[PDB]
Every structure is written in C-alpha cells, then in structure tokens.
Amino acid sequence: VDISTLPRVKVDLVKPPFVHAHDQVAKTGPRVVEFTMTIEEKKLVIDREGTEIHAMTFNGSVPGPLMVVHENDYVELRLINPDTNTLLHNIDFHAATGALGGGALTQVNPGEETTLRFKATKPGVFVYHCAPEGMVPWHVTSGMNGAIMVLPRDGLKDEKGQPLTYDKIYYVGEQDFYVPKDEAGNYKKYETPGEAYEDAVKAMRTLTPTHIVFNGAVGALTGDHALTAAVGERVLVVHSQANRDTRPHLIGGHGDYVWATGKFRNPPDLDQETWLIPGGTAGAAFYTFRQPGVYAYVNHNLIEAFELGAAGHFKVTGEWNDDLMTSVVKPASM
Amino acid sequence: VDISTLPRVKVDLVKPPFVHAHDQVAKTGPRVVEFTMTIEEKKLVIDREGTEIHAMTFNGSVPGPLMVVHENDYVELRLINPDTNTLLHNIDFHAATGALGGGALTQVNPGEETTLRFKATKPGVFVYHCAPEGMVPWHVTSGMNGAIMVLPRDGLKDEKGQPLTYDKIYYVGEQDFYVPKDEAGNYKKYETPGEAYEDAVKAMRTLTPTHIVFNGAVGALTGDHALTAAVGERVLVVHSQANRDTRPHLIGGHGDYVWATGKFRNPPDLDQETWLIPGGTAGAAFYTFRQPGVYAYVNHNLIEAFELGAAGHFKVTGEWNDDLMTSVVKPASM
Amino acid sequence: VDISTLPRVKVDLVKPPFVHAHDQVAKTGPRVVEFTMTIEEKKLVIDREGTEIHAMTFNGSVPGPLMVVHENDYVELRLINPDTNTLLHNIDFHAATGALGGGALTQVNPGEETTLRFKATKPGVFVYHCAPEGMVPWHVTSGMNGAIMVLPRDGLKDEKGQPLTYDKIYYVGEQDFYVPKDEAGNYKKYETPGEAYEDAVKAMRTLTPTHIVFNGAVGALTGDHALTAAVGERVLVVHSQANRDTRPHLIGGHGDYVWATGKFRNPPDLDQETWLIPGGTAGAAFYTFRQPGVYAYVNHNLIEAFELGAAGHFKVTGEWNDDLMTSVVKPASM
C-alpha cells in the first residue's frame, strides 16, 4: 500500500476569482489532496437585461472553483450530486490520465456521490468539465467547467530557469453561453431541461455565443468585485475556456510571462500583448504591475469583450510613473 | 544532371487514417520519391442522416492520403484527372517553394495528367490542397486536401534533442463542410457543379460549417474503424485542417510532445491538454499511452466535436494502472 | 530632468503597406521619437461592388501607419482630431504601460489635440487602436487601428541569437468589417453615425464579418499595388489584426522565422506554413525569397481570403530554380 502511507490534506475551496490557499514551492512530499464539490443546478442572471438561464455548476459558481495541487500529488475528489438536481453529471479532468479524464468513472445521478482519485503527473493549469455521454457541450456551455492548477514542486520558473513567484493569483473562467433565440431574436425560456434540449442544440450549432462572460455574468469582475493589485505586485491570472478560443489581454499592461496553453514544463512566452487560449484549455499569465489606476482585462475580440460580456477590471493602487507614461499636452482646442 | 543520378523510390499510398510505410531515420541518401494520385469527384454521405455531397478528392478519400518523405528528398507527383471528372483541378503543396506551391504548374482538365517535382527543403507536416484560380475555397471545402510529412533525416527529436520514435502513426484530416441550406434549414442538393456554385459561395460566406468531420464523415473513426493502440505504445497523430482552425484534444490523455503548427526544427510543446492548429496547417502530437480503454480524440470546441462531427475514438488494450487513476468510491446513493 | 536631455527625432510617417525609414540596429542612444497623426473620418469603398462605409482612420489610411522605434525610446505622439470630424477619439498603444495604453489620457473631441508620451519598454510589434469608452469595437472595426514596431536596440535575432536583417519590410493591416445587412442580405447605409450605431452593434454581434481586407479594401495589395521583392531578398511582413484572429500564409513560400504573437524577446518559430495571429495582436514573419513569380499572401481561412477579401500579392523578380521546383511533365492529355 503506497498511497495509504501518504499524508492527506483536506482543501476547502473558495469562489472564483479567488483561489484557495496553497504554497508555490511544495513544503511537503507528495500528498493525497482531498477536495469535495457539490453540483448545483440553479437559475443564473447573466446580463444587465435580466436574461436568466439554468446553469449547471460545480460548487455553485460559474466557473467552478480552481483546485491547486503539486505535480505527483494525488487528487481525490468527492463529487456529490444532490437529489435536488434533475440531471446526471460527471467530471473530466484534463490533468488526469485514463477513463476519459475521469468521466467514465464519475457518472452520478441525482442523489448519488462518488470519489475519484488520480495522480497529477503533469504540471500546468488544466480544464475540468462535466461530460455526460451524448450531452457534453450542453453541460459545458451551461457553465459546468472550471480548472485545476498542478504546480511544479519547485514552483514556477521563467525562460531561463529562474524562479517566478506570484504575490496574488486570480482565476478567470470565461463562459460562452448559447441562449436560444426565436426568429425575432429574443431569448427563449423553457419549462424543463428535456423541453429545452433540442433548441439548446440548435442554438449551439450556430457556433455563435449570445453571451461570453467572466465569472458567470456580464460585469461580474467590476465595481465592488473588480480584481485588485498594487504597483510592484506580481500577479498570476489563470484563464480557462472549456469550449471556445479566447485571446486575453490586459489593457494598459502585458503578460510578462505567458503559458498560453498552460503547461509549465515549457518556457513562457515573454512580453505578450495578447495570447490565444484554445477552447478546451487553461492558460496562465504573470504580470508585475508598474502603474496604478483602472485596467480592463478582456478577450481581445472587442465585440466579444464589450458587447457580449468578456471584460473585467483591475483596480491598482500606488504611485504613477511619469517616465513610463505621461500626458505631455492634455486634450485641448486646436 | 544531379537529380537523374539519385535513387528513385515509388510509394504506394494508403487510405487515411493509415500511413504508407516509411523509415523515421533515413536509411538512404536523398531520393526522388515518386507518388501518383488520381483525382476523384464522387458522392459522399457525410452524416448519420444521409446527407450527400459532391466531394472532390485526391485518391478517393477525404482527406487525401498522407505522403511521407525526408528533408531534401524530391517529391515527384504524377497527378491524374480522369475524363470521368467534370472540373479542372491542381495541387498546392505547403511543403514546396515556388509557383503557388505547385498550383500554377499543375492545372489539369478532365482527361489530363501532369508531373510536378519539388525539393522538400523544410521538415514538418504540411497541408496540400487543390487551388484552382477563382474557386479555391470551394475545392478545399469539398474535401480536396491532405498532408505531407517531411521527416528530418535523423528522425524526430524532443525539446532536449533526444530521439522521439513513434511505434504507430495516424493521419486525422479534419474537414469543414458548408452544405447549402434553404431558409427552413434543410440542405439543398444540386444538379450540376455550375448550378451549385453560387449557393456554395453563399454557404461558405456564413463562415459557419454545417459539418466538421474526421476522415470524411461523422463517426468515420469509430466502431470497427476506431484508431487502436496498446498501453506503452508511442503514437504520432498528424492532424490537418486546410481551411479553419481546430483545437485537438485526446480525452483521457495528452499531447506529450506537440508541434502545434507542425514544423520539426522547433522544439515541441510539452504536456499539452489541447493545442491550436490554425486553418491552413498540419500539426503533430506524440503520446505514449498509459491506460487502456476507450479514448475520444476531438476538436475541443465540443459543439464542433459532438454536434458537428469532429470526434473519433481510440481503443487501447492493456493493463489498468490504479496508481494513475482509480474509483475510490463508485457512484452510489447519498 | 532626464527626458529633456535626450535627442528628439521627428518621424514623417508613410502610408501602409510601406514603412517609414529607420535603422534596425540603433545608431544612437535612446531618443524621444516624435510622431504626429491626424484622425480622419472618411468614406471608403471597400469592395469591387462599390460598398461604401464610413471609416475612422489614423492618418487617412486603413490600417493606420506603422510607427517604428527602438526599445527604451520614448514615443511622443501628437494626436489631432480636426473639427471636420464628428466623433470623439483616442488612442491605446498595446506597446505602452498605464492608463489603458494611453486611451484614458488621449480623449480628443473634434477640434482638439493632445500629446502623449510613453516609454517603449518591450520589444515587438504591437497593435494600436482607438478605444472610446462604450464604443470601442465600433471604432476599431471602422478601421481605427494600426501597429507600432519596437525593435531591440541590436536588431532582430534568430533562435540561436544570430542576426536577422531584413532588406525590405511591409505592414499588412487586416480589417474585419461588419457592414449592416437587411433581412434580404443587402448592405444598409446610414445618414449619421448616431443613426448607424445600433445596427453597427447588431452587425458586430453576429461575429461574422462581411468583409476582411488588407490595406483597407478588396484587392488593395494587388495589381499596381502588389508587394514586390527579388529572389534572394530578405523580407519582414508585419501583420496586425486588432479585433479578430487571422492565420497568415505566403502561397508558394513560408515564414522562415515567425514571431506569431509578435514579441522579439522570444525565439521565432521556424519554417512555418501558416501561423495564428490572435485578434488584438501584431505578428511578424521573415522570409528569404527563393523563386520568382507571383505569390499570394492570405489569411488561410480561404473563404476569408478569396471570398471576403483577405488576400494580397507579391510580384517577385529573378531567376527560377528548377532544383527547388519544376514541371517534369506539363499538363497534357492522358
């Protein structure tokens, strides 16, 4: 019995965009890291207009929470589908090896639970998502996806092999929704999931999202829920998109070090303006803030950002650097 | 006369997803590698519903067959357009240099043939496709595309310069089709290619495929035609998309080493969950299987995969590794 | 006063695809490089059919001109919005740090000007674009975007750290337009920008461009305005797309060295057939021509290229190399 001799540590997850506490450099040997998530089907208002969908969530949020482990830890997930839900669900970890990432082993009807263990053999950020046979994109595009970060045991490294240490981390999950439209263009609503299914499929088959949002709704990462930092702070932004390409961009900043396809054995790309995270991937960008003020963090299809919802904000405190940027002559009459 | 002094070797092509026999490390000096392909316009049923299109093929298949040579070999292609076809065709090799990849030199009316030679000066997997002036996307999106692999003379190498040797290779060609739709959404059929052309153009201009398939049809790489491997086997999957981006993903596995844009002088990306193959590119992923069972291989726009057709299967034999993954508690009642 | 002690140099911009004169290796220490651009709202015919839009331009062109500086120069832009325009405009440089890339500091009503300075701290090609709060994608997709190249002080380097020196440089700006369509599919025209705004938003929300063009119009980089080179010449092609992914490809050639996401501290990708430039990015490809004749340079979604406009030409002079490619048997009767 190898695994029974290992330490167990129980993690208590937090709601995105926050991330549960962890240590970048592993302070122990390999562990069995225990997580519990409870599936919740719930109504969610996703825009300023009040559009309401039936979301399918891990742990009550879109995205599901970020799990964090180290390479060669074991992830042990207790997945609970309470009897107050209506549908069968499961979970596929892109971090895992075998059984469709776990999906073949985790099919839970309402009123059931299961516990899956897998060894996190590859370092990176990875998508996880529900994937019930025959209804995969419906569950994913109903919000039933999140991410897991598998840190190298010795933490992150730059392109030269020197340490990169973040002061803060955020998890931005980006969700494409396909709210069914009638022939005048208004959303339709449905009375049961079975009654909704064919028009969900029809809406998905357009390949044209109605909404593309961060943290589950238009504007979710703004106002009192803007992301925060201070000048000089090193920030890692993990970004996932389980179904569709995105192109993140920090307006007024950069990705100083970017793993666009999320896998830490590779050297990061330096000095990115914008990067492509393919659908079905998590990526990660590291930035050291150099200026205070408001930033926007967007998918840089600017229609997707500013019309469909894929935009959030940072509020950054600290001192303005006029060497880096200044208004020499403020806007005024010619 | 340099080239006439070189060995000639005739290759007999095989139908995708299989690949003609070759040697990873070159066992001879440079050669003139002789290929023959016969263009075939044919009706193809592309989905479970019986939707039938007029496909334009190299060698009778969608995709066309994978050609394999080594760097600095010469590729000599005899391209035959029999008089039983109706259209002019040609061929552009992305591996080649000059004359629009060969397209300017290979225009063949029905009843004609031609022979093109080019030097394969750059190692990688590359798209080839038909490209007749003024009707390029129509031919490509009618299936008239494949790929060529130009191996380094000393075979594949990892990011550290150590050998990577595959045990098996498969070629997955992914095809976006644009079957014209009437205003209720049913497909239209046509009586001649000229009568079809304007509505093909209209359908293409939507930028929304009706079908996205592997090996020419929904489900083609499933059932008795699933891809196969054994635990411990090293597999190279070449994947091409001549017209539109894709994002391959092995469900339950990874791309251990990935040349997402297909060019072997570059170090591979390690440990990919998903990778972006741009339209107009071939990529290649190397994986060593670690678990038995069924895998799905998909474009990870899961709508494209599970609703539009971009999904195939592996059946993998061998021993299950409970250290890598296990069900600790099988699904059961709370 | 550090900056007032630096040399000032005034640059006179040129119209794309040409690029103002500069030195690859910096011949001076850091400078304040002075640019002036005058915003022009103007009617533009964008296709062969005569479709006319109201373009929003920097300096009268779509794209705006390419600015060129070196790392750690200061860019000082005088941005003029004459009173003959109707709208508020600004500028965001992806090369810059702070204040939304400058956009927060550069809001100019008609009849106003402003001068912004920023330090070009990161080497690469970068997008710049207008971004007025609440109307960002409308301005960008009306053509109000260009690029800036920040060269390393010691010029470009290959993957091994050896110099790469271009003989010629071109700037291809690729623009997605969303011309509003009525229910039969014809374009609509508008009488004022305010009257156009809602249907511009509706057209953009389809995520389906009506036109995708190089240098502002279908065919702009063809005929007397084809790009030119000679066999043996080293050419850098800078390519930007401020809003939507593209996949450039030189038909009959390659990208010998490609910074697909545009940032020169990273080693280039070698031997690319096609590469993905994410929306919101500039990329750069270096190629040494080896064959004469006509080439096409395209977005390799071939529908986007040949039906929607994303195609230009090179005319290359010099000697044909039959070792690289030859017609062994010209097209003729079977």
Ligand SMILES: O=N[O-]
């Ligand atoms: O609801 N804001 O447009």
Ligand SMILES: O=N[O-]
């Ligand atoms: O510990 N090897 O998967």
Ligand SMILES: O=N[O-]
């Ligand atoms: O926080 N150490 O770099």
Ligand SMILES: O=N[O-]
């Ligand atoms: O276009 N993204 O899948």
Ligand SMILES: O=N[O-]
């Ligand atoms: O960088 N603003 O799109």
Ligand SMILES: O=N[O-]
């Ligand atoms: O996975 N490389 O970012």
Ligand SMILES: O=N[O-]
């Ligand atoms: O024909 N299967 O849905």
Ligand SMILES: O=N[O-]
């Ligand atoms: O053999 N040089 O192309």
Ligand SMILES: O=N[O-]
């Ligand atoms: O098959 N040799 O690794």
Ligand SMILES: O=N[O-]
């Ligand atoms: O969206 N692919 O061309």
Ligand SMILES: O=N[O-]
């Ligand atoms: O990994 N299943 O999409």
Ligand SMILES: O=N[O-]
């Ligand atoms: O072409 N690099 O995969």
Ligand SMILES: O=N[O-]
């Ligand atoms: O106007 N040319 O199709």
Ligand SMILES: O=N[O-]
């Ligand atoms: O010169 N440091 O931004």
Ligand SMILES: O=N[O-]
């Ligand atoms: O132009 N010097 O390579």
Ligand SMILES: O=N[O-]
């Ligand atoms: O599909 N490009 O944003």
